[PDB]
């Protein structure tokens, strides 16, 4: 997943964002949520709303500076986005570079993406400028079981330029 949609024009992206807002205004949407569209040749079509946070929220936090999960919790406490949580008006919402998220899993791509299981012997996580990690279950000694998803760690990168 990437953010923003760097391959589409900023006018067109903005039109998509307004359509999502219009829908949410109409129903009085509260808390975090996402509006999903399919896009084809400068037209766009609504497909679903996910009325919760999503796995890929991380990249939006990085290009806006906004902490979405904190925001969810503060909204649920009855707070005002602008007044108490501190978000600016729409036109002032930052747009800082771009960001990309990959999920690193035990899915084996040479075995039909079947998720591997067993013990983790070694786990060394990188860092530096432009790197964000949100770990799942991965640490030296951890036994990956077959009962849940195969996610080890989510990696995001961010920078001024997409490249």
């Amino acid at each position: 997943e990437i953010a923003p949609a760097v391959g589409l024009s900023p006018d067109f992206r903005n039109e998509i964002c307004e359509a999502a807002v219009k829908l949410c205004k109409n129903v009085g949407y509260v808390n975090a949520g996402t509006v999903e569209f399919l896009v084809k040749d400068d037209k766009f079509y609504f497909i679903e709303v996910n009325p919760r946070v999503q796995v890929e929220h991380t990249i939006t936090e990085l290009i806006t500076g906004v902490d979405i999960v904190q925001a969810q919790i503060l909204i649920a406490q009855g707070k005002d986005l602008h007044r108490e949580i501190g978000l600016p008006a729409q036109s002032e919402i930052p747009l800082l570079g771009s960001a990309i998220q990959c999920r690193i899993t035990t899915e084996d791509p040479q075995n039909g993406f079947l998720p591997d299981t067993g013990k983790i012997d070694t786990y060394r996580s990188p860092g530096g400028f432009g790197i964000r990690l949100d770990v799942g279950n991965a640490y030296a000694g951890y036994e990956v079981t077959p009962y849940f998803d195969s996610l080890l760690v989510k990696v995001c990168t961010f920078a001024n330029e997409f490249s």
């Binding site: 902490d67 904190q70 919790i73 949100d134 770990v135 799942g136 279950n137 849940f148 996610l151 989510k154």
Partner: peptide, 18 residues
């Protein structure tokens, strides 16, 4: 919940004093 998203929420909570 469990896993990364639970850890993600706990971090926000702690930063908010919860």
């Amino acid at each position: 919940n469990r896993g990364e998203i639970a850890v993600r929420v706990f971090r926000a909570c702690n930063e908010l004093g919860l």
